[PDB]
Structure formats: structure tokens, C-alpha cells
Write a protein that binds this DNA or RNA. Structure first.
Lengths: 248, 87, 304, 302
RNA sequence: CUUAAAGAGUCAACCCUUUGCUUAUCUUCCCUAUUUAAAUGUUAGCAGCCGCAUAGGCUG
């Protein structure tokens, strides 16, 4: 039919809050889709889509400047310099509390699914952040669009992310539409020739640059079509919602 | 002068699902969005932003845009709304 | 010929602490906790800088964050969790040959001692840093695998023998030596006195509004996960002219003081790792140092 | 040649006062404490600056914080604790050699006098600052090691000899000259009169609707721990042409009077420290001053 | 298969003096709150005895 598993109040400490060179804050949908796919690889459960919501969130630092992290020495040929503060790249970190909902292909009993999900989460991070504590995951199911609303409100309370597309461009839309940019995918700039230095020796490699959309945050309740708030991979190496652009 | 220079050290590397396969993506930043968009958000009085100076202390050793825009570049403050304490 | 190192060899960290939240309680009423909130105050002072006396007659106003115990609670309570993770040899970005022959050369490493010193730094409360200064007593409660251990005042700079530290180091070394994970839930209680200053993590920000910013999570005083981490992995008593334990660093770096105790003396992580991989023989404590660097994690760069 | 001081040589403070809370009681019913709350009031005045008489016909409105005893309580009660911490020669940040030879150069410092003058500033009520003016009587209560001590009638500006001050200073010097710590728990009772203005610490806020703002904790009038501390370490009578004791500052700075009684005459902490480490000899009072600067805390490096 | 993998912000601090917020004042007119009803949760518990008593058992 349609099965989901919800994990509420995922306290995460130490998030890599830089999603791109011009976006620092809430981890983007690409991150949670990658998390769902990591779980798919590690457990075998097929993950159709994911929906995430912020319960608490704070970037470290002040209002207009993010915190610095103290870089520790790490590279060879630096012993003649390890007696002084290591030079330093920017790496804003954050701390938060999220609620997750994964749509899954499951035919078995709920206890097995929940235990496999918990045993995966115990080995994961979220956007690099250490997972400190999460509630017991629970399963729900929906046949018609009425039970989908119950699955939706089961995440309460949290602010989930809807995709409202780009009219002009990121900057003009931020100024005029009072919305928030978000990394939604990537654009391939050039193929990388040699995998001498890559995570794989075989997987195709490309230099890329992020592609964005314009998102909005809304209380899972006030969202009508829950599909409009479920993110998954897809066309043209982007990610998007099952229900498309948000306007009910 | 518009010649490419490949270099992947220190850069992030993510897998990304391409048609039920995977490509390794190595993200790099776009100069236009920071030079132009910083100037634009400045013009149009957009304040929901972090200021981030690039190439610290010795910017001129980094990039001409970093070298001549020492005030910093504007980043979209992507903080989400928070569930209030009382519920 | 010589098995050289990859350009980058990367391991994830295996000691994963959370943030430490700071509450205030009374020493004999530990079930009525209240959060310690970060406040702001004005601070006027003098120009007591070593350089120039010509401006010591001028002042400087300043505004800073501060955090204190309430005037009706005498005990600081610090809470966090630590997750230890196995597979300490699976590289995250380094190659296969170098990393695997290194995993082979280090399988005989004393994991009992490393686990003991980690758990001991946790139980003696080294992670409390300046919050130790001037405490009447320190009481540490560690809950692991449905077991609850209590530790009273413990000597921090010596890894003295204790049966409960060892009983927890059993499971910790079991996870580190193999795979899986184990989570300790740590509480600290310090009898400091009513209204005593506590010491949350200090923020590294370019903020013109504050001269000192304390780390806060929705207004409550806290400590960075990475600072608790730097405290835990302070176990290195094996550098030359060893005095006190320092944090596991590839160069024995203590930038805090402007010295590196493993710089240019054949005892840095890279010299010892090249030795271990290229057939050389390792001391038990050189093995411990290299494997503790692997437990630390890192993105070690340079090479081909 | 010269032992240069490490660039990051720093000591942590050893006299740790808390913030002081301000209550109101009656002089003869001290078990009924009520808290003094900071309020806000409008204040209208004249433009009476020395310079311009052209604005002498113009007024000015402000809003300010204010703090009063109620009209049914006549005594101000100021409460705080002070923790003295030993190991006053172990540096916080500095390296070894400079700090170690400085520790050796000062092991003959008069710790009795230092501890006595600290405890005396606490017992004579210097820590009360402007709350001392207009008192029918002041009564200080110091509890330490399950021993209670009461003080009335102590001259603030003279270090007169007192047996209880010396007995407390004994424990304080036992901590300061060795290791460990000790907490004195201090109350001050001042018979000011019902409705008397009291003087908490003042704040600075760049631009606010308030022209004058008082330090509060949950709305209760309070004093900054650093102000109590500054009163505690007012023991320096050893600068040149010394009248009254000043607070121990490396340059003997009194920013409120725009002068520095130890700046520019080879009497500053840095000159004396360099001398002490580099072989030169110090007076007994100079050793006291340098050790008092080490107890104050601060960065002593380039 | 998460812009993956990695990281100690740290020492120290007197915000101080002074103050007139003054004068005057019309809140007025109008008004349908209506139908109907099982508190269920059978309530859900305890008073006395034997007892070395937070072992177990027994009284209408």
C-alpha cells in the first residue's frame, strides 16, 4: 500500500552547516536524500522518498557571522610549523533537532523494520553531525489521502520543507518573494580523468557546481498534500518533491 | 587565459544517484554568485545573511575578487524556523 | 619499491562525543535540575598590556557573555554522551594497499590501555576543563549497557588503577578492537558553591558586539562536542621528555602554548606510519600512538 | 642572554568573587529578606554643561533604572561569596622557564600581608562602594570553615590590626601560599533608612531607550563580580608617593582619575618581572606587588 | 552511499557624576444568541486477622 517510518526528535550536534559557498544553515534536501540512500545501501530496505523537518536549529556564532572551527595540523611536511596555530579555512558548524519520515517498501512485520532502522541510525551522521539521541522509530501506513494526513500529522511538531520553484533567479526571488535558497542538485562542469585520488577507482567522476531552488518552511499540518513535502532523487541529477511545486 | 586547471585535493566528494547508478561529484563554487550576488544583496538591502571573508589575513594571495572585496561575501542565512518551547 | 602513502589518507573519528549541556542542582537534591543560562554584562577595565604604558591612563569598556550558578544552587551538573565505534582501520579516502598493510601491522596494538585511558579521562572528568578548578568534590555517573557506575574524586594526570574504569574499558576495547559500537551516558556533578562561575565553551567568532561569547543552545550554557573530544583523547604520555598526557596529535601539537612535542625528532605520526608500513618494528606505545591517531580520525595529506 | 617572556604567558585569577545580590531587611529582623528590584523611571533635567550656556534654556528627558529599599525596610543586605584558589605561581598559558624562575624569585613574598589586606577589604566593606555612604552602622558577616565572624567599626582606608581579620587571613594565606581553595561567605547589613537609594552596578548599552541602566539578575539589583573583586585587591600602597591604596593593576591604573601611578618610572609589573627573572633583586613590597599581579591574573606577554 | 572524511578560542577587567515631564479634555447612537443532548470509563480502590511483617495466606 504505502508504508512510512518516522523518527522524531533527532538531536544532532556538529552539523556541517555550509551547503554551498552562498548558503549556510539548514542542511539541504540533497543531504537527507543521501542519508536515505545510505540507509538503503546499508540495510537493503528500499527508500522511496524522505521528508524532514526542523524542530530546533542554531548555527554556531553570532547573528551575522558564523563560528570558526580551530583547525588542527594534519598534513606531512609541517613539523617545522606545528608549534603555531594551524592556518584556517571556514567551516561553519551548527546544532539542531529534526524529525524524519522515510517512505519505504516493506512487506514484513514492523518490529523487524524498526530494529534494522535503529541499528543503521546508530552508525550514521546527519550532514556530518554526531547523532546524540532519537526517539523510537514507529511505522505508519496510508491507503487514501485521508490516512496520508494522519502520517503527516504524526511528525508533529516540526517545520518541513516545500519546493516553490524559481521565478527569476535565487537573489531576485529571495528579495521579492521573501523565500530561502536551497541546494537542490548539481550541474556537471567537467569529467575527471583519473580516479587516483577519488573515493572509487571506477565510478564516473565530475567536477560540479550546485543548482538551487527556492524553498519554504511550513508546519507539516498546514501542508495539505503531503507528497509536496516528500523529497527524492530524480531527473537531471537534481532532487525534488513527489507533489511538485508547492501551491496546494 | 580561460584555461582549466583540474585539482581535487581537499575538495569534498559525494556520490549522487544518476539513473539508478552513481556519479562522484566534486563541488566547486561559482564566482558570479559571490561577486554579483554580494553586490546585489547589498544594493537591494537584503540583511538575512552571514558575512564571510574568504582567504583570511592574506587575501591577495588567494583571488583578485577576494583581494579587492576584503569586506566579505554575503551568504544566505538558511536557518529554519524553530518549534517554540511551549506546546 | 617502498610502499609510499597516498596523496590523502582519511579516517573518520571513532570517539564521538555530543555537546555537554550545563544545569544547576543542589548536591543532595539532584532530581530538581535547572538550566544554566548565558547572560550578558558590561565590563570596564584598564589597558594593562605589556607593550605600551603611554595609554595605561585610558580605560576600555567592553561587553561579554557570562554564566553563573544561581545563588540557591551549589552544584554544576554537566551532561553528555560518548559513542565509541569500531572498524578503526577502514580508511574513508586513503587507498587500499597502504591502509591494509597498515591495518595488518597494527593488529597487535594494546587496545586495553587506549580504552582504559579514554574511559579514565571521561570518569575523572578531564572533559570538565576549567570547571574543575575549586570544586569541593567531583562525582561522575556513567551509564553504559544498562550498567551504572559512580566515580568520586579521581587523579586526572595519573591513570591510576580502578576496577570500574577497567570494567568499562573492557567493552570499549572490545568495540575498538573489532566492530560495533558502545555509548556511555555521562553525568558530572561538581560542588562549587552557590553562585559560582561556570565555564561554557567560548565561541570563535568575528562579533563586534561581544568581547567574549559563550557557546549556547537556545540560551543554555554548553560545551562544544569537539572540546570534550580534545579532552578525552588526551592520553599521549609517550613523547620524548614526557611529563603530562597530551592530546593525540600527529605532531604532538599543543598550539595553546606554542610548542610541538613531536616535531622533527623521528617520532611524528608520519615517520612512524611510514616505518610501520615499510617493514620496520614498532614499540607497544608507538603502536598505541599511531592507532590512537587513527581513532582520532583525520585527513592526512601530502605524498605522491 | 635575556630570558624573554613567552608571548602568551598568562595567569588565571585566584580571587573569585560571585555576583552580589541586593536584598532589603529590617536591622532587627534579618530573617525576613525581600529582594530589591530594578525599576525604570522618567528623569527630566537641565542642559547644564560647562561649555555651552546657549542651551541653558533647553531641557532634556531620559529614562533610567533605579533601585530603592522599600518604605517598610530600613537595611540593605548585600550578599556574595569569594573563593580563594592556591597554586598562584602555576601559569595558565605560559611555558616553563620564565614562569619557573619567576616562581623561584618570589617564594619570599609576604603572603601574610596580602591575605590580610584582601580579607580586610572584605571585612571593612570596601566592596560595598557607594552603598557605604549614609550608614547609621554597617555589620559584616563572614562565614568560613564552619566559623562565623562579625565586623562593625572598621576604617576602610587604613589597614588597622584586627584579630578576626588576621585569623581569617591565616587560612587565606595558607591557601594562597600553598594549594587548595577556600570560600568566604559574606553578608553586609547597612542601616540606610527606609526608601533609600541603593547603588547596583551600572551597565553600558550602545543605543537603548534607557540612558542609565542597572545590573540586574532576574530583575533583582546586583553588583558585578569584577567590581567586588576590584575592591578586594585594593591593597597597593607601594607605588611612588603613595597616598591611599590603589587596586593592583600592572600599570597601577586608575582610569577614573586618568592617571597610572606605576606607568613610566620603572615600577610597572613588566619591568619588575623582567628584573626578577633576569637576576635583579626586588624589594619585599615589590615581591608583594608582583605576586598580587599574578593573583589578579592576566596576559603578561608580547 | 549525507559540500563525505578532520579540528580546544583562551587569559584579564570599577561604567561613573547630575536631573521637575508640564497645561487641557463629553467616547456617542442601535441590538433576539439560538436547536439538541445518557458521562461514560463498573465506578476501581479498600477496611480487619495471621504473620517477622515491602514471604505468603485468610475474613463479609
Amino acid at each position: 500500500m504505502r508504508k512510512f517510518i518516522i523518527v522524531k526528535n533527532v538531536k544532532v550536534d556538529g552539523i556541517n552547516a555550509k551547503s554551498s559557498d552562498i548558503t549556510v544553515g539548514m542542511p539541504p534536501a540533497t543531504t537527507f536524500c543521501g542519508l536515505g540512500e545510505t540507509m538503503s545501501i546499508k540495510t537493503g530496505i528500499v527508500v522511496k522518498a524522505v521528508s524532514y523537518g526542523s524542530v530546533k536549529f542554531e548555527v554556531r556564532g553570532s547573528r551575522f557571522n558564523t563560528s570558526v572551527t580551530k583547525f588542527a595540523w594534519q598534513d606531512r611536511g609541517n613539523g617545522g610549523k606545528a608549534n603555531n596555530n594551524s592556518p584556517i579555512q571556514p567551516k561553519p558548524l551548527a546544532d539542531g533537532v529534526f524529525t524524519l519520515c522515510f517512505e519505504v517498501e516493506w512487506e514484513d512485520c514492523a518490529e523487524v523494520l524498526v530494529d534494522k532502522v535503529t541499528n543503521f541510525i546508530n552508525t550514521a551522521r546527519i550532514a556530518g553531525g554526531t547523532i546524540a539521541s532519537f526517539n523510537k522509530p514507529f511505522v505508519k501506513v496510508a491507503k487514501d489521502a485521508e490516512e496520508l494526513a494522519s502520517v503527516k500529522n504524526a511528525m508533529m511538531p516540526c517545520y518541513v520543507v516545500v519546493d516553490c520553484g524559481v521565478e527569476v533567479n535565487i537573489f531576485e526571488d529571495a528579495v521579492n518573494r521573501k523565500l530561502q535558497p536551497m541546494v537542490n542538485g548539481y550541474k556537471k562542469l567537467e569529467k575527471i580523468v583519473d580516479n587516483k585520488h577519488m573515493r572509487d577507482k571506477f565510478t564516473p567522476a565530475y567536477l560540479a557546481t550546485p543548482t538551487y531552488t527556492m524553498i519554504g518552511y511550513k508546519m507539516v499540518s498546514n501542508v495539505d498534500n503531503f507528497d509536496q513535502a516528500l523529497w527524492q532523487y530524480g531527473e537531471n541529477t537534481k532532487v525534488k518533491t513527489i507533489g511538485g511545486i508547492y501551491n496546494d | 587565459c580561460c584555461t582549466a586547471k583540474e585539482d581535487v585535493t581537499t575538495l569534498p566528494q559525494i556520490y549522487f544517484k544518476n539513473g539508478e547508478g552513481y556519479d562522484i561529484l566534486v563541488p566547486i563554487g561559482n564566482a558570479h554568485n559571490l561577486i554579483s550576488g554580494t553586490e546585489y544583496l547589498w544594493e537591494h538591502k537584503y540583511y538575512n545573511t552571514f558575512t564571510q571573508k574568504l582567504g583570511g589575513s592574506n587575501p591577495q594571495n588567494c583571488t583578485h575578487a577576494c583581494n579587492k572585496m576584503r569586506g566579505g561575501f554575503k551568504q544566505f542565512n538558511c536557518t529554519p524556523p524553530q518549534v517554540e518551547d511551549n506546546y | 619499491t617502498k610502499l609510499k602513502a597516498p596523496a590523502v589518507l582519511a579516517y573518520s573519528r571513532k570517539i564521538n562525543p555530543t555537546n555537554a549541556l550545563m544545569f544547576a542542582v543542589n548536591w543532595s537534591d539532584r532530581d530538581n535540575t535547572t538550566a544554566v543560562m548565558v547572560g550578558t554584562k558590561t565590563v570596564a577595565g584598564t589597558q594593562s598590556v605589556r607593550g605600551n604604558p603611554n595609554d595605561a591612563d585610558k580605560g576600555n569598556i567592553q561587553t561579554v557573555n557570562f554564566a553563573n550558578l544561581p545563588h540557591n544552587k551549589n552544584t554544576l551538573l554537566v551532561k553528555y554522551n560518548v559513542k565509541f565505534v569500531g572498524d578503526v582501520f577502514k580508511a574513508e579516502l586513503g587507498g587500499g594497499e597502504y591502509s591494509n598493510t597498515l591495518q595488518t601491522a597494527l593488529e597487535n596494538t594494546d587496545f586495553g590501555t587506549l580504552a582504559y585511558r579514554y574511559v579514565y579521562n571521561i570518569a575523572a572528568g578531564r572533559t570538565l576543563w576549567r570547571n574543575r578548578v575549586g570544586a569541593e568534590s567531583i562525582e561522575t555517573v556513567i551509564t553504559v549497557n544498562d550498567q551504572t557506575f559512580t566515580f568520586s574524586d579521581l587523579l586526572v594526570n595519573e591513570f591510576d588503577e580502578d576496577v570500574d574504569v577497567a570494567e568499562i574499558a573492557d567493552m570499549v576495547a572490545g568495540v575498538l578492537s573489532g566492530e560495533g559500537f558502545v555509548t556511555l551516558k555521562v553525568e558530572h556533578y561538581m560542588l562549587l558553591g552557590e553562585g559560582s562561575e561556570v565555564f561554557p565553551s567560548q565561541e570563535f567568532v568575528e562579533n563586534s558586539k561581544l568581547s567574549k561569547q559563550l557557546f549556547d543552545l537556545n540560551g543554555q550554557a554548553a560545551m562544544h562536542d569537539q572540546k570534550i573530544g580534545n579532552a578525552i583523547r588526551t592520553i599521549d604520555t609517550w613523547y620524548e621528555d614526557a611529563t603530562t598526557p597530551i592530546a593525540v596529535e600527529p605532531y604532538g601539537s599543543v598550539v595553546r602554548n606554542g610548542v610541538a612535542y613531536r616535531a622533527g625528532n623521528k617520532t611524528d605520526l608520519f615517520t612512524l606510519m611510514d616505518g610501520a608500513v615499510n617493514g620496520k618494528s614498532l614499540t607497544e606505545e608507538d603502536q598505541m600512538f599511531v592507532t590512537a591517531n587513527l581513532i582520532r580520525g583525520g585527513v592526512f595529506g601530502g605524498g605522491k
